[PDB]
Design a protein around this ligand. Structure first.
Ligand code: KDM
Length: 386
């Protein structure tokens, strides 16, 4: 495929944006509250061009449960595109009430309004149960009760991310009755060419019909979908789910529409995955249309981050793409894990990528940071193995 973007000089910048407690400029809230680790990134460019970057602020250690607040940064202006560290505001909080887990940021932009879907659980519960919290208490396993299940929340901003509504619990509307575990995203939702909002979630899409300023939400159930899904519209106008598999190996993919539903999910042997979240992005709709995909391109490691382009109408096949390790960051740990992508207003891919200092190996004390990257399509296309 002829691609004019290759003619641009390759461009890339990369730096830590969410700095764990061990780092020189560790990110803290204005209250003084700091965080051991930041995980689970989500990023969107708003219709103003401002960029909003979200994460889980994991207060005491790197684990998925306990006291976790939903934190964020915005770019200082609507036209800086997050190009340098000095272009980013200080850390802020969307929600951090109680001692429970607020997480799984999954934003979608609708004119303007930013809708941020979130998962929540009580601070005494964890996915497996039996985990020891910092105060000594042993968690109960997430269950099907109102009190012990994973909830689904929506918080909305109508001032370019400056302020956020009190999160609304939409579990009874948008999560099947009798579920225990749940997840939304994490990463992002999308707005279709036809106007609907589609937010990927465990076993389902959350679908916003209506119009901007008057959205109505419902569930499209997807048998065989992952817990952590991604969605985009492909050049043929259909929907594409590319989800984390339940076991390490390969991404699982399904295609469909809002009106007629989805195919079954199948392993995509072109996209190895170690059972980790990934991210997908519709980059552009005219010649040549491109879908971007980002994950760890390995069946056993999260440290093989690879960004790729598909030109196919159904995103069937991707190029080799480029290893993010070709432009490594120093002093922010070993990069790899969950990721999120947006298209900036200056026509770059903006990506957030997890990084792990590994100071406590695989244990809970290992500090986690999140790296911000900008690169043009040329950078991907001019990679050594592409
Ligand atoms: O680093 C991970 O893999 C993680 O643990 C991080 C997330 O906070 C957690 O919600 C998610 C979940 O455990 C799996 O999707 C299995 O349902 O995975």
């Amino acid at each position: 495929v002829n691609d004019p973007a290759k003619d641009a000089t390759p461009y890339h910048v990369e730096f830590p944006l969410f700095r764990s407690a061990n780092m020189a400029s560790a990110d803290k809230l204005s209250t003084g509250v700091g965080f051991h680790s930041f995980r689970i990134p989500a990023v969107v460019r708003t219709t103003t061009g401002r960029i909003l970057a979200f994460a889980e602020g994991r207060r005491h250690d790197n684990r998925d449960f306990g006291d976790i607040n939903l934190v964020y940064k915005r770019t200082k202006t609507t036209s800086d595109n997050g190009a340098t560290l000095s272009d980013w505001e200080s850390l802020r909080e969307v929600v951090g009430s109680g001692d429970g887990t607020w997480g799984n940021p999954t934003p979608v932009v609708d004119n303007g309004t930013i809708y941020l879907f979130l998962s929540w659980n009580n601070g005494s519960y964890s996915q497996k149960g039996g985990d020891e919290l910092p105060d000594g208490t042993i968690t109960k396993k997430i269950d099907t009760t109102w009190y012990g299940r994973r909830h689904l929340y929506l918080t909305t901003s109508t001032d370019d991310g400056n302020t956020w509504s009190k999160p609304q619990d939409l579990t009874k509307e948008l999560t099947p009755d009798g579920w225990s575990w749940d997840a939304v995203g994490p990463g992002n939702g999308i707005k279709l060419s036809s106007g609907e909002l589609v937010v990927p979630a465990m076993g389902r899409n959350i679908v916003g019909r209506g119009t901007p300023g008057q959205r109505t939400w419902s569930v499209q159930r997807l048998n065989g979908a992952g817990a952590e899904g991604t969605v985009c519209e492909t050049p043929d106008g259909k929907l594409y789910r590319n989800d984390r598999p339940s076991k390490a190996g390969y991404r699982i993919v399904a295609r469909g529409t809002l009106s007629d539903g989805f195919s079954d999910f199948a392993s995509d042997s072109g996209l190895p995955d170690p059972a980790c979240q990934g991210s997908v992005l519709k980059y552009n709709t005219d010649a040549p249309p491109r879908t971007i995909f980002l994950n760890s391109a390995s069946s056993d490691s999260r440290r093989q981050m690879r960004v790729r382009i598909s030109y196919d109408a159904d995103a069937a096949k991707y190029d080799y793409g480029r290893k993010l390790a070709d432009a490594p960051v120093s002093g922010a740990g070993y990069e790899g894990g969950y990721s999120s992508m947006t298209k900036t207003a200056d026509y770059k891919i903006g990506a957030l990528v997890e990084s792990d200092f590994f100071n406590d190996g695989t244990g809970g004390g290992s500090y986690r940071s999140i790296i911000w990257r900008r690169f043009n399509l040329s950078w991907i296309l001019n990679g050594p193995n592409n």
